[PDB]
Amino acid sequence: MTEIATTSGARSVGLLSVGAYRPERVVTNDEICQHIDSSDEWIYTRTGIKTRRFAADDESAASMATEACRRALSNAGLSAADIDGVIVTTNTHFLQTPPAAPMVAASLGAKGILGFDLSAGCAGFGYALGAAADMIRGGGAATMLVVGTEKLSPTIDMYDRGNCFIFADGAAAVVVGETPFQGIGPTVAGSDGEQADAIRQDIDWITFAQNPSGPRPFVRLEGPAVFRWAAFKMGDVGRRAMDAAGVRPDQIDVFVPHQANSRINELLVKNLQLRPDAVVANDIEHTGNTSAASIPLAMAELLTTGAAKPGDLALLIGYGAGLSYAAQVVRMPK
Amino acid sequence: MTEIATTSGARSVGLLSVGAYRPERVVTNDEICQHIDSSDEWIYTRTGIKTRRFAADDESAASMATEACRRALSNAGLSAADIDGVIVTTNTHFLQTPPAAPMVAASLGAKGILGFDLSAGCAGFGYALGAAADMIRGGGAATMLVVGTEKLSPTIDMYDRGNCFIFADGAAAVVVGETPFQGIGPTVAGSDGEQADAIRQDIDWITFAQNPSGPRPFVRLEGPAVFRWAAFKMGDVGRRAMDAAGVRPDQIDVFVPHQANSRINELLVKNLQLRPDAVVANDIEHTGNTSAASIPLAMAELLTTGAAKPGDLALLIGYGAGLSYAAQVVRMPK
Ligand SMILES: CCCCCCCCCCCC(=O)O
Structure with missing residues (x-):
């Protein structure tokens, strides 16, 4: 057949x-x-x-x-x-x-x-x-x-x-x-559509187009909702990504969470039980939250300062809008 | 390590x-x-x-x-x-x-x-x-x-x-x-960003937002350009999709091209060397061009009239905007 x-x-x-x-x-x-x-x-x-x-x-x-x-x-x-x-x-x-x-x-x-x-x-x-x-x-x-x-x-x-x-x-x-x-571990991802509003464009483009003199659309952020969500839920996501990659917390050399907020990531660095000398991305200080480009920009920065070296074992955790998250363990590039 | x-x-x-x-x-x-x-x-x-x-x-x-x-x-x-x-x-x-x-x-x-x-x-x-x-x-x-x-x-x-x-x-x-x-053959895809203008939104949302009283955005189509492109290039894409799937043109039971224009698709049916009794989707007559929903809507239509039966060997070819195309041979669902 x-x-x-x-x-x-x-x-x-x-x-x-x-x-x-x-x-x-x-x-x-x-x-x-x-x-x-x-x-x-x-x-x-x-x-x-x-x-x-x-x-x-x-x-x-x-x-x-x-x-x-x-x-x-x-x-x-x-x-x-x-x-x-x-x-x-x-x-x-x-x-x-x-x-x-x-x-x-x-x-x-x-x-x-x-x-x-x-x-x-x-x-x-x-x-x-x-x-x-x-x-x-x-x-x-x-x-x-x-x-x-x-x-x-x-x-x-x-x-x-x-x-x-x-x-x-x-x-x-x-x-x-x-x-x-x-170099790329299994993908661990999910979401929470129940919280889609936490990070949204307030007015859709067509409604605006049909009411030009009316209010124009802007990005709105419900900071606290997002802060809580990530801080409390990305730790579990981190472990699943490591588990799927067959690696243990102490083997992680580099941690590259989404550069959403330092306060959230510092809390994650502790909750993930990473080893004390684990390098953590903090590219946000002079880059802010660049959403989809955040992680790769943060990886580039860690390498840039030599904080991370090619081959290093890194944990990547993206979290944000739509209330979507995606994580994986990888070997640093370049 | x-x-x-x-x-x-x-x-x-x-x-x-x-x-x-x-x-x-x-x-x-x-x-x-x-x-x-x-x-x-x-x-x-x-x-x-x-x-x-x-x-x-x-x-x-x-x-x-x-x-x-x-x-x-x-x-x-x-x-x-x-x-x-x-x-x-x-x-x-x-x-x-x-x-x-x-x-x-x-x-x-x-x-x-x-x-x-x-x-x-x-x-x-x-x-x-x-x-x-x-x-x-x-x-x-x-x-x-x-x-x-x-x-x-x-x-x-x-x-x-x-x-x-x-x-x-x-x-x-x-x-x-x-x-x-x-049930799903290897994906065959590509594009032609050189013709990205062929199907486009004429004015980007931000420019419009900064000039509300100016002209609003609408979808534009350079019909002839798309017609010629699809008609002349999708045949080769179909053959590659069939090749990757290890099937011959005569073995295709159902053909489901993007419902862009019936004349483009009639030309493709001939150019693909499909057998005379091959069933071809024509959902376009009462559905028009629904872009991304076109192919699955066309598959449902063929199955509904009984023209296509579950298990049928089908060739799907999506073509359109950005000047992007994606094709694969599959077994009909439901
Ligand atoms: C005869 C003028 C009508 C325009 C027909 C051009 C056919 C291409 C339209 C479909 C575009 C698409 O791929 O979504």
Whole structure:
């Protein structure tokens, strides 16, 4: 009887490199407070944030994704010609269509390679990485680009006081391909749609379009709800990711949680029973919460300062919007 | 050092069922011809469309995805409790965040299952299907929901004689899980970002938001460009999908191309060398082009009339926006 064929690729997959792009402009809490009622100290105190980058007007999630990919390719010693596909994960591509992925591939000179946009709120990176690994192992690609990119600044209500100092822009990509050793552990993910409102665009685009003189949409954040959720639930997610990867808490060298808030992550570093000398990402201090691009930008920073070395065993935990989370254990890139 | 472990699932994966939801408001060509200088015969002879469905104002891509999934689960004799994850593919979720996936899972009572939104324009279904299959084989889930949903009507410029009669609304989901036989063939996909302009939202949401009194965004289509592209390039894509699946053209029982234009698809049927009695989807006549929901809606239609039977060998070819395409050979569901 005719049977549909089954294919497969390299069983061992890993992060060949990481490339990060940060917008030239810097924005201080004071600059922020020059339109808000609070302190440049109460900010960096309740949220380890001191400064963040805002992209120019002529930039987009797509353009920053492209530059991030160029850097990842160079850091991996590859050219666009070595890439089989690209997954752009973002929440700020301001067009219902076309997707950013095909445009990014074109800008890289990457022919008609497959690609798509993945949106899972802040945890889109973990979902995209897992997807790239599954595709490569399944034989649908051999080498891929996974880039998290975000241009949130244009969606911030400078008068929100609840998040205007939280979100920021930026993009970071990783090259995923075959490695001698297993570099990407099993994906652990889930969500809580019951709390979809905790991080949302308040007005949908069509309603706004039908009421142009009415209020325009802005990103709203129910900080406490998110703070509690992550702090209390990401510890369990961390253990599952380690368990699935067959690793124990004490074997983790690097911890890269979503750069949502220092207070949440410091609490997680303790609840995960990581060893005392475990390196922890704190890229948020001068980058803020870049949602989907957060983790890959944080990984790049840890490597940047040498705090993390290639080969290091890291625990990645993305949590955020939609109330989605995605985690995995990986071997640091570059 | 410590080797990161792996996990794996069922090698044989397939379509357990399909569930389709079509908005109740039927819009005829004559209704469309109240705002353009055309006629029913002109539109029908050139596109193959006679009527299409428009969703109500209180409906959304997410609400239609929910209902489609409910039907799919029922057609598979399963409950939300049997689902491990859900992938929503769409291009008309009018919120930059949160994603529709977490909300859809919540609405189905599928507690906190993993999920994300995937946009590859019109070919998002093929990509999501392949991703679901790769995840299940990768052991990241055992059973999943893949739902294409689209509420394009609000993005249509009623005066655009180039596409006002083309796009429509609807949603259809399939349950993906382990099957005795291999039911999903290898994914064959790619794109042409050089032609990203062929199907696009003309004005990005932020620019509009910063000039509310200016022109609002609408979907635009460069018909001829798309027509030529699909007609000339999908044949090669179909052959590759069949090759990867180890099947010959004559073995295809059912052909389900994206319902973009009946003339493009009639040309493809011939160019693919399908046998004379091959059943070809023509759901477009009363459904129009529902982009991401097109293929699963067409599969449901063929099964409903009994034209396609469960177990039938089918060739699916998604093509569209961003200039993205995704294809695979599968065994019909339900
Ligand atoms: C004859 C003019 C009508 C336009 C027909 C062009 C066919 C392509 C439209 C479908 C676009 C898509 O892939 O979603």
